[PDB]
A paper describes a structure:
Cyclic GMP–AMP synthase (cGAS) is a cytosolic DNA sensor that produces the second messenger cG[2′–5′]pA[3′–5′]p (2′3′-cGAMP) and controls activation of innate immunity in mammalian cells. Here we show that cGAS-like receptors (cGLRs) are innate immune sensors that are capable of recognizing divergent molecular patterns and catalysing synthesis of distinct nucleotide second messenger signals. In support of this conclusion, Hartmann, Imler, Cai and colleagues have identified cGLR2 as a second functional cGLR in Drosophila and have demonstrated in vivo that cGLR1 and cGLR2 have discrete roles in Drosophila immunity. Together, our results define cGLRs as receptors in animal cells that are capable of detecting diverse pathogen-associated molecular patterns and dictating response to the foreign environment.
Residue numbers in the entry: 28 to 430
Write the structure that this text describes.
């Protein structure tokens, strides 16, 4: 009976959730806060070194690392960090290097050489102090006629952001080490700076990302404001559409030195309050299954799976999403969606639906993942049973170091 197959997945999804959820005691909670406090003070000292970072800055801390697909970043060409082996808890931190207003969108966002969901950032119309403050981090474009333009470069900013962190941390290393978190690793992986801190028994991974902060909602995502979504009535619209980000990632066509990617990372944090726990549990189970065998050569990012999980919140009324016994049906629905998107090489962005997030995949690689997915679809409980063992093994690796 197919009802017996549903109960088996419901049991495995519930068992997977038991070992996947992070529960910290009072000791681990202080170890995490001490590491976060050191990161925040480090960024404060980075602002004191070069007066480039804003004096009044607002960071965005997320519970997962970049390689876990928490933000729309290009996960390819990123070295792999294993939980329990290299870190015990992972985090990503968006550090705004610039703060702009809603009125500054049509005059600073240059999207004439960029695909959808991407843009250049023109600093031409800023005051002379800001232009001179970021002149070394911009792509200067001189013209025979017309004003010289300054495009905020994601590459130059990342190198400066990494050098500033390296300088601040190197000075702290000279002074005696008492009460300071032992820095396990400092690496510049593309436009991402990864720091592993050792505070007590646990190790913390922080993927710090240099970001451009914007106030208001993107003009290219205007249509997303014109339909009633699932969060309508459960959370206030002001908390969702109050701002967006520019993440240092380019499209497969754009210029790596000039192009940013629009990120709705803080809109999704507010939307997580409305997503049902059952659909969320199936998402975490589906993520632990596919990202293993669907990562090479061109990985399908967990953010691609997060978008489909978000798409499933609107196309689907709250009734079927509410009942907890339908967790197996949610996991299979995400697998069927991950099949349809691969077959047509089409995965629309949840906030900018006309943006295809799979246009960078070749026809060969997307067919290979579709054949690998058919083996997962035919036996979803077995791939989930293996994913539970990978989480239990990582939970004992972290515990062995804490013990």
């Amino acid at each position: 009976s197919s009802g017996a197959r549903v109960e088996e997945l419901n049991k495995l999804i519930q068992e997977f959730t038991k070992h996947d959820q992070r529960e910290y005691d009072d000791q681990r909670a202080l170890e995490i806060h001490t590491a976060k406090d050191f990161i925040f003070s480090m960024l404060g000292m980075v602002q004191k070194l070069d007066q480039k970072l804003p004096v009044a800055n607002e960071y965005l801390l997320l519970s997962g690392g970049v390689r876990e697909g928490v933000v729309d970043l290009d996960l390819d060409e990123l070295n792999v960090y294993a939980r329990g082996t290299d870190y015990d808890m992972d985090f990503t931190l968006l550090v705004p290097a610039l703060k702009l207003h809603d009125r500054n969108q049509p005059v600073t966002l240059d999207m004439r050489h960029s695909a959808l969901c991407h843009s250049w950032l023109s600093l031409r119309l800023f005051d002379e102090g800001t232009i001179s403050k970021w002149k070394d981090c911009c792509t200067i474009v001189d013209h025979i006629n017309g004003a010289t333009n300054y495009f905020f470069s994601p590459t130059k900013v990342a190198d400066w952001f990494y050098d500033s962190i390296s300088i601040v941390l190197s000075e702290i290393q000279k002074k005696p080490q008492r009460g300071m978190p032992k820095v396990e690793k400092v690496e510049k992986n593309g436009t991402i700076i990864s720091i592993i801190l050792g505070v007590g028994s646990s190790r913390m991974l922080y993927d710090i990302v240099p970001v451009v902060s914007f106030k208001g909602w993107p003009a290219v995502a205007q249509s997303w404001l014109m339909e009633n979504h699932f969060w309508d009535g459960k959370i206030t619209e002001e908390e969702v559409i109050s701002g967006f980000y520019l993440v240092p990632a380019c499209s497969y066509k754009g210029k790596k030195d000039n192009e940013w990617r629009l990120s709705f990372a803080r809109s999704e944090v507010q939307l997580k309050k409305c997503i049902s726990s059952s659909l969320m549990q199936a998402y975490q189970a589906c993520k632990a299954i596919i990202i293993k065998l669907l990562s090479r050569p061109k990985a399908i990012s967990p953010y691609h799976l997060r978008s489909m999980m978000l798409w499933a919140c609107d196309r689907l009324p709250a009734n079927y999403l509410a009942q907890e016994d339908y967790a197996a049906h949610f996991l299979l629905g995400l697998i069927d969606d991950l099949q349809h998107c691969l077959v047509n090489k089409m995965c629309p962005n949840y906030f900018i639906p006309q943006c295809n997030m799979l246009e960078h995949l070749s026809e060969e690689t997307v067919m290979l993942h579709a054949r690998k997915l058919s083996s997962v679809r035919s036996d979803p409980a077995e791939h989930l049973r293996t994913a539970i063992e990978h989480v239990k093994a990582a939970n004992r690796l972290t515990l062995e170091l804490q013990r």
